[PDB]
């Protein structure tokens, strides 16, 4: 563990060493080479308990990576619903793009993560915003053949129009 960074501890879900390394030094929001916080590493590897612990101890969920990667997008991309809910409850932006033109919703749709798609839409993610190529989240779900996802999105759009 001496060899492991705080990021790696968070990724592995090593709560004990992680908690110790935080007392030793104020490193809770210390970014690695790519701008990733311990929280982003934890979110990316689905470590719910570590995410809870870091957020309780002041980890900032709005900090972004070098390419504007977010903890939210990392979690969405892998379908870690419980982590998505925790971050959303912190009031992060749900509609922001990174440099690779991805948004949380596009990553959820790309990974066929239906519960994540539903949760994002309920928190204000807009399925009509487009990539630089002109396609939106509905388009992508159709393109990829993810029918349960297409239906969640369409149902959402329809209910907006039906009030």
């Amino acid at each position: 563990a001496n060899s492991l960074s705080v990021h790696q501890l968070a990724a592995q879900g090593e709560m004990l060493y992680l908690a110790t390394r935080i007392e030793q030094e104020n490193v809770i929001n210390h970014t690695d080479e790519e701008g990733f916080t311990p929280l982003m590493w934890a979110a990316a590897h689905g470590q719910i308990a570590v995410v809870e612990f870091l957020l309780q101890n002041g980890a900032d969920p709005q900090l972004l990576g070098k390419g504007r990667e977010s903890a939210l997008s990392l979690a969405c991309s892998k379908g870690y619903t419980d982590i998505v809910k925790m971050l959303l409850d912190c009031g992060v932006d749900v509609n922001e793009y990174d440099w690779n033109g991805g948004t949380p919703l596009l990553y959820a749709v790309h990974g066929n993560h239906v519960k994540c798609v539903k949760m994002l839409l309920e928190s204000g993610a807009d399925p009509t915003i487009e990539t630089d190529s002109g396609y939106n989240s509905m388009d992508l779900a159709v393109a990829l053949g993810y029918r349960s996802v297409q239906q969640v999105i369409e149902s959402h759009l329809l209910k907006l129009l039906q009030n």
Binding site: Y107, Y135, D139
Partner: peptide, 13 residues
């Protein structure tokens, strides 16, 4: 690796 996000399509369609 640093965790990474998947590459999305540059066009669909």
């Amino acid at each position: 690796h640093t965790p990474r996000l998947p590459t999305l399509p540059k066009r669909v369609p």
